[PDB]
Design a protein around this ligand. Sequence first.
Ligand code: EW8
Length: 162
Amino acid sequence: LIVTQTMKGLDIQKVAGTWYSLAMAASDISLLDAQSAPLRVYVEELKPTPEGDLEILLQKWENGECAQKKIIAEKTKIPAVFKIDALNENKVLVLDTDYKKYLLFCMENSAEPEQSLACQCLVRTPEVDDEALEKFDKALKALPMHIRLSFNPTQLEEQCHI
Ligand SMILES: CCCCCCCCCCCCCCCCCCC(=O)O
């Protein structure tokens, strides 16, 4: 609920398939600065269940190499918001998507201390999409980000964007 842009009328079935993590931003540099930083995750695929939960396939660098990870995001009463559960119960919020080209999401830790908030611009192809990046940057202008990364088409085709 730090982020107050939410996709009205989200049809979670339609975000299925392959995505590319074109850009990332976080409120804390340490969340994204190294290959093995904790929210440096490269989205591969979204797999919505029939009950409306969301299976997530991603990569993450750990122990000197690019590892595949599977993650379950459970639905809530709000169609745009999901919970990772696991250790801290992180919420994931879909800000905006048009399903066939881009999707903007943010995630926050359900409490703090020092605020942890990270967002991504996903796109459907290995292409720099200026319009989506522009919407991403607009979405974030009033959020307190201190690190922003983006990736070139070559990196997007490589595991962990190396
Ligand atoms: C509805 C659109 C939603 C798309 C965006 C997905 C959001 C990704 C959130 C990723 C945070 C989790 C941090 C990485 C944990 C590694 C995994 C450890 C393991 O299970 O072995």
